[PDB]
Design a protein around this nucleic acid. Structure first.
Length: 447
RNA sequence: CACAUCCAUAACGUGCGCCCAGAUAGGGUGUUAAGUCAAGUAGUUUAAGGUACUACUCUGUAAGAUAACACAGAAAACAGCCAACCUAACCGAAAAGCGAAAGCUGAUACGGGAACAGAGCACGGUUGGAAAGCGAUGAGUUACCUAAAGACAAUCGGGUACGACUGAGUCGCAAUGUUAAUCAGAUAUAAGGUAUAAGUUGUGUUUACUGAACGCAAGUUUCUAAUUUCGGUUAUGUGUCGAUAGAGGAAAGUGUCUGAAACCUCUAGUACAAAGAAAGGUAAGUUAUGGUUGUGGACUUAUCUGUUAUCACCACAUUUGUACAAUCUGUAGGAGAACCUAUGGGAACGAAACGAAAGCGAUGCCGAGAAUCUGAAUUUACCAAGACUUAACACUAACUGGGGAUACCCUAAACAAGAAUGCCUAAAGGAGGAAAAAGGCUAUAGCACUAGAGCUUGAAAAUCUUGCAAGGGUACGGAGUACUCGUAGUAGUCUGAGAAGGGUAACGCCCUUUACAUGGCAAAGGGGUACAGUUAUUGUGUACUAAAAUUAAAAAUUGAUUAGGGAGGAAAACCUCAAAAUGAAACCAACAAUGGCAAUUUUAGAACGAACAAUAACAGAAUCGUAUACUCCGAGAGGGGUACGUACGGUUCCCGAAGAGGGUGGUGCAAACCAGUCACAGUAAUGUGAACAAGGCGGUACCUCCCUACUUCA
């Protein structure tokens, strides 16, 4: 089936030695190797990942290439290519996509496997967080409170991700110890495959039917090699960055980047300029925004919808850290769907909502509860539960307006909301307007 | 630091609509007449006007009483509302004769019934004068400590919207509108309000356009906003701690024990002035996305005789500006969280909102009250509608006569038409014998495919097919032209229009004369027939040649750039019996650097497809002049949508299926009593038995098709 790479990347042209990163992965080859040997390469033409609830569908056994990829059947990948990077709602980290083709919908597991190949080596943390993670939520909560006690701190801004798809440093750093020192080509001839017909051309990735949903993998690497020497120079300087500000460093991610333990912002420049030189050394990318708004001791930056600055408002601090919740992620998240106008009722109400004549109601209620759910998960360990339920207030009258509006009455939202509501205390009934909100903005949040 | 409130109010959705003849049957409409009304009290005066005045009376005048007279007002009838209240319309049922049921037949009785507003014409009509409402509960069932923190007896010690219920006792808003009484002028070109359609792009609002031509002007409503705790989570108050302020420091501060150096308390909210401190009422504006408003509630602006005064004088919000007051208050940038200047508590620090914007001259219109000044008047000077009745005259319809062709539905009408005896004992008797039917009769039973029944009919008869003059219903706004038939009539003079021309309108109507025999009329639905937009199906389609936006980029040189030619087991080596159990020449891979034609597009070398042939044109949101309440003031300009009440143009895009009503085909289930069939009795026909293969027939299930004035979804 597909032992093509199982042979290419494995034997790896040992004229002289090879995949040398072996003192930590020498039998770490055959483990996952023989996995795929019977995970993917077992007999599959049409399976192990894809449509059928995880897996590809066996409509024609999808063997038209899969079994016969000894030379990939290859030779052009015409596959009209376009551009694709999809932003992410919370904790901005764009999630590009591509063109769904059974061809691409098997290239997907192919690159899954090449991931696992490059997975076990010094790659770390499928999507972002220096610690090996998988979720944003772990990235959302864990790393942050741990440090920041050092003032004078900074962050990152360079867009540099789908703009700086360098594609030269890219293929220079994809498979160094993995490319067979000679004869390793039947891998990326069909990864370098952004073909088109518009009297123009752009190859190999922009969220490409060759390169659509795999930028996670690729860009994560792209940055990872950077972060390696980044950390080495980090420790090289971590000799007053943990020892200057003290008398009374860095961590890596996907899109934005903290500066960990701080000493002498008088060297924050040092950091950023060195970065740039390096950001311009081998990937040759700039400092979008000249990045970041140095706190200069404490002044709150923003990461992923949270931060630290080391009457609707009150807080407690000291020699301790903190993890800020915000309002701009809700502010326009209100002016989007006509959900309020803060210049109407005395500081903050849900003065109104949008929908007045629309489809059935209980679905809209579940919709409310759904965005609330999101809010909860999209807000882990950040303080001020009271702003959360404050917005919940700022959501009630609005959603209840919309409920009533189907009746098309006299603003009879009173009796209307009485015809339902987890908050009216009456399926013609709101299951949750605040309950699950409290539940999940406490669980997986307060710990 | 919890808990919590965000405006309540009805529609519009009635039933009708054709054709002409008439016109009090009634009614309406309008106009003129006459009377006829009623005016706080009387005089005045006069008609019996009218309210002007005189004097008398009354009521109000909160800008917080108290007396003076100023100041205003004093009915009635209408218009309306609010509630109760029969009753014709309109509705269903008896009801009722009725094709013999298709359809009619509804003051019976039936509830009702301001018909879902009366917008094409009010339910009526009596009354009554007040209902729905809110904002305060009046009365009952009631609460936490009894202000020390309690535990104690709620020492009702004591509090009813106490907070809940029952529930308002009382008020206000609810609950009104008009109605005759000097002119003339100026201050109006007054101060002030008013002038671009169905509509396109342009974003630095600059305006490139039209049913705008006006232009200027081009950026911009706004927030962004409180230090004398405005620290404690938005407006909601309570729940606080923090700091200062202690008061008993208890047995509470009703009577008992632990209280504490806490646990209540006002908190602890700065110095002036300043004003009403204040409502209510009226008036204007904000009020809540649906579309219309109404009716209230809240915010804002004004509002409501003079002194004699008692009063009058205060707490408190209040406003200023200072101080100062901290969170600074944000900002800006540096620079420690507590520096740095700035900021008015926003300077920007934006952000949203922002694009023939607004604002400026477009003069377009009028320019009330005409407010004030001038003159005039000044017999109380006058003076004429306010309705009611009648009168007359015109008028009139969802009123009064006669007028009914196109297609459906139904079946009576014998409506007319077309459907006919075996069997012997195998022959007259004859089946209207003695076998032997449907049909005749009746509920019709066995799922249909037997009605039992007796003779019967064994043409009787009832066969179905029609037709079905009938009889109904159905369309009698209105949705492009002609054109057709159905009636040439009934207005015959009189303005679709008879004609000519002229006003003739963003498509008519009216004026000079046409005609008296149709000269108009023609009728009156309705369908028909050809054209015209619709929607689709299909037939159908372009790189037809030129350059270009350079995919085509094969080929060729390049980019000799390294890496090749083994689906393998393969863990640093084993590499797979493999040149090979680790050795190329070109064939993939490099800005394809150029072609190269397909894939465009337009410039464009451009010929019924770079578009056309047979089978659907419904649904309009209302539609500008032509109004439509016209909408609203009228002092004007000008502001909305009721036969889809647009009546056309244009505007413009919606272009659904299902519930499934009923018919259609097929598929099945069943069924095997009758005629199918078999065999048996029987002389046969019938009886007997099998007989489901659904031969038909019906029951039933699916789906299909019609089917959709059967129902309903963008």
């Amino acid at each position: 089936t597909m032992a093509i790479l199982e042979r290419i990347s494995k034997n790896s042209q040992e004229n002289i030695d090879e995949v040398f990163t072996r003192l930590y992965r020498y039998l770490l080859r055959p483990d996952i190797y023989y996995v795929a040997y019977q995970n993917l390469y077992s007999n599959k033409g049409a399976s192990t990942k894809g449509i059928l609830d995880d897996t590809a569908d066996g409509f024609s056994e999808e063997k038209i290439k899969k079994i016969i990829q000894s030379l990939k059947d290859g030779t052009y990948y015409p596959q009209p290519v376009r551009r694709m990077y999809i932003a992410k709602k919370n904790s901005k980290k764009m999630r590009p996509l591509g063109i769904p083709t059974f061809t691409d919908k098997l290239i997907q597991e192919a690159v899954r496997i090449i991931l696992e190949s490059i997975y076990e080596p010094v790659f770390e943390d499928v999507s972002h967080g220096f610690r090996p993670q998988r979720s944003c939520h772990t990235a959302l909560k864990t790393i942050k409170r741990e440090f920041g006690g050092a003032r004078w701190f900074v962050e990152g801004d360079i867009k540099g991700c789908f703009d700086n798809i360098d594609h030269v440093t890219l293929i220079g750093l994809i498979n160094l110890k993995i490319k067979d020192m000679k004869m390793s080509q039947l891998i990326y001839k069909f990864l370098k495959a952004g073909y088109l017909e518009n009297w123009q051309y752009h190859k190999t990735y922009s969220g490409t039917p060759q390169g659509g949903i795999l930028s996670p993998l690729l860009a994560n690497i792209y940055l990872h090699e950077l972060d390696k020497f980044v950390l080495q120079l980090k420790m090289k300087f971590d000799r007053e960055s943990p020892e200057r500000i003290t008398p009374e460093k860095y961590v890596r991610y996907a899109d934005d980047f903290i500066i960990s333990v701080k000493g002498s912002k008088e060297d924050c420049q040092w950091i950023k300029e060195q970065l740039k030189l390096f950001i311009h050394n081998k990937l040759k990318m700039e400092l979008s925004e000249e990045k970041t708004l140095i706190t200069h001791s404490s002044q709150p930056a923003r990461f992923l919808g949270y931060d630290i600055r080391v009457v609707k408002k009150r807080t407690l601090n000291g020699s301790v850290e903190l993890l800020i919740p915000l309002q701009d992620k809700i502010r326009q998240f209100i002016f989007d769907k006509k959900i309020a106008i803060q210049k109407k009722d005395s500081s903050w109400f849900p003065v109104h909502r949008k929908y007045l004549i629309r489809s059935t109601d209980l679905e809209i209620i579940t919709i409310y509860n759904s965005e609330l759910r999101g809010i909860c998960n999209y807000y882990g360990l950040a303080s001020n539960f009271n702003q959360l339920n404050y917005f919940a207030y700022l959501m009630e009258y609005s959603c209840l307006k919309t409920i009533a509006s189907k009746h098309k009455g006299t603003l009879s939202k009173t009796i209307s909301m009485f015809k339902d509501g987890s908050g009216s205390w009456g399926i013609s009934q709101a299951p949750v307007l605040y309950g699950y909100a409290r539940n999940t903005l406490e669980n997986r949040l307060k710990a």
